[PDB]
Design a protein around this ligand. Structure first.
Ligand SMILES: Cc1cc(C)n(-c2cc(F)c(CC(=O)Nc3noc4c3CCCC4)c(F)c2)n1
Ligand code: NI
Length: 313
């Protein structure tokens, strides 16, 4: 009945945001292991769900074009003022990335070289709940299999929003939906495996032990160090996942997620070694995060995103 919009198809349902392609490149952000809810359904046209609404995004060299599917028996219209603000905040466009790129480049020659080809790699501001459970699914996994688990989870537990072509879009489920007695059994049938236990247990933990998703909003305004320790109390959430949520959902730009893949890059590209544990360890991982914060400063997580994205391509 309804299909994915292109900029050529129905231009009268698109609104623009004055966004240089140096400030944001959709193709290096939306599928670069931050969000797992965006797909290039048509060429240079990215479709995904944001807060119970579906968006399609495309860009020129100077403009970011966006169209909304409000997903109901409502008159089709262009993005509103409030809806465009939501997208402005989601891409954190108030913060200059050009000024950050130059600042990082001044103290790191390796970044200066990589940065040239890979511009507009910025850090998305995600919903804490979506980010939390997305990154519990990320353990010993790849972007493709993570994307599948998150989609299947959302269809199974989340409310239906709209259908565009063959793709049916579901909003991310609330904690109560994931905390139910059959939840783990269902998630195992959807292929999450062991991660199904942590999803249910963490949903149950936030509700019962922390008092619902207002807790995650408290961690947003809490110091990085307090937020990180609070998150590490949840089943399946360790230092790596806690840092991911801190950087991508709780407004901690200094948070640097460290796993074996970040170790590889740090060693190979920066010559970094732990100043006892020859290989990775909780203490050595903590030291590596500090090393990058000392080097790049209070937006070290955003600098890591540039390298991480550049490494995927
Ligand atoms: C063996 C293999 C192959 C692939 C494609 N992966 C893979 C890739 C991923 F992107 C992710 C997700 C992720 O961890 N993203 C991130 N971690 O720190 C950061 C990011 C994003 C930008 C800020 C810093 C994953 F869990 C696995 N692993
Ligand atoms: Ni070495």
């Amino acid at each position: 009945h309804m299909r994915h919009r292109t900029l050529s198809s129905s231009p009268a349902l698109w609104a623009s945001i004055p966004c240089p392609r140096s400030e944001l490149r959709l193709d290096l952000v939306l599928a670069s292991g931050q969000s797992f809810r965006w797909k290039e359904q048509s060429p240079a046209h990215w479709s995904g769900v944001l807060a119970d609404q579906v968006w399609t995004l495309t860009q020129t060299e100077d403009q970011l074009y966006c169209t909304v599917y409000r997903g109901d028996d409502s008159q089709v219209s262009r993005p509103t003022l409030e809806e465009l603000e939501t997208l402005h905040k989601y891409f954190q466009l108030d913060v200059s990335l050009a000024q950050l790129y130059s600042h990082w480049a001044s103290v790191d020659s390796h970044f200066q070289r990589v940065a040239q080809k890979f511009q507009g790699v910025r850090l998305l501001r995600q919903d804490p709940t979506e980010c939390l459970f997305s990154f519990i699914c990320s353990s010993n996994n790849n972007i493709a299999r993570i994307t599948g688990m998150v989609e299947r989870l959302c269809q199974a537990f989340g409310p239906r929003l709209i259908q565009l072509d063959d793709v049916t879009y579901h909003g991310f489920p609330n904690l109560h939906a994931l905390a139910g007695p059959e939840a783990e059994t269902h998630l195992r049938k959807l292929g999450l495996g062991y991660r199904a236990r942590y999803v249910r247990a963490s949903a149950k933990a936030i509700l019962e032990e922390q008092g619902g998703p207002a807790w995650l909003q408290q961690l947003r305004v809490a110091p990085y160090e307090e937020a990180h320790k609070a998150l590490c109390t949840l089943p399946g959430v360790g230092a790596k996942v806690a840092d991911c949520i801190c950087l991508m959902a709780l407004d901690k730009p200094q948070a640097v997620p460290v796993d074996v893949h970040v170790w590889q890059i740090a060693h190979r590209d920066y010559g970094w070694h732990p100043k006892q544990a020859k290989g990775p360890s909780p203490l050595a991982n903590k030291e590596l995060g500090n090393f990058f914060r000392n080097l790049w400063g209070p937006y070290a997580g955003w600098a890591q995103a540039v390298l991480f994205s550049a490494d995927l391509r």
